[PDB]
Amino acid sequence: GELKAIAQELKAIAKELKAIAWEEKAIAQG
Amino acid sequence: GELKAIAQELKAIAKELKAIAWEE
Amino acid sequence: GELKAIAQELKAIAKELKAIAWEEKA
Amino acid sequence: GELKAIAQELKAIAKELKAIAWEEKAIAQG
Amino acid sequence: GELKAIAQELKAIAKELKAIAWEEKAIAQG
Amino acid sequence: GELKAIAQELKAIAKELKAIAWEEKAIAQG
Numbered sequence: 001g002e003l004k005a006i007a008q009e010l011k012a013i014a015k016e017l018k019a020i021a022w023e024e025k026a027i028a029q030g
Numbered sequence: 031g032e033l034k035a036i037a038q039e040l041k042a043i044a045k046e047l048k049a050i051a052w053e054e
Numbered sequence: 055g056e057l058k059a060i061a062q063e064l065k066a067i068a069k070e071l072k073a074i075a076w077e078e079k080a
Numbered sequence: 081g082e083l084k085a086i087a088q089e090l091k092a093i094a095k096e097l098k099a100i101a102w103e104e105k106a107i108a109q110g
Numbered sequence: 111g112e113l114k115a116i117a118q119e120l121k122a123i124a125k126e127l128k129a130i131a132w133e134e135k136a137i138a139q140g
Numbered sequence: 141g142e143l144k145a146i147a148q149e150l151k152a153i154a155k156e157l158k159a160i161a162w163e164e165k166a167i168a169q170g
Contacts, residue, residue, distance in 0.1 A: 056083035056084050056086075057083065060087050060090060063087055064090065070097035070100075074100060077104055077108055079108060080107060080108045
């Protein structure tokens, strides 16, 4: 169903945001 | 239906965040 | 309907993220 | 009720992303 | 209800994006 | 239920945005 599809996209979005934070952390260090 | 439309916009959102994560 | 309104705001959000992603960096 | 409240928060989110885009544009142009 | 919980998380999300816009502004002006 | 799952992913998204705001702050300050 579509509510499950929505939850799955939000999970993917959280994962991408986590990756963005991790990359920014490297920039902040350097 | 609108729930499908919502899921499709979230997919577009994930795609652009994936580009942001990747770049630079 | 409010579901349509939600879909329309998410479309606007995708569009702003597309602009953010694809603005050429200095 | 709550679906309207959700729509209103998404509008606020779009507005903040527009501000982010505007400031990144300024970073790019400095 | 969970719809209220969703609205409350979107409010938190808007608040974090406002913080991000302010920090991009600091980068632009810094 | 899936509405709860959606709320939980939005909570994760708020947390990652908080991390991004922190890292942008770190970039702004060197």
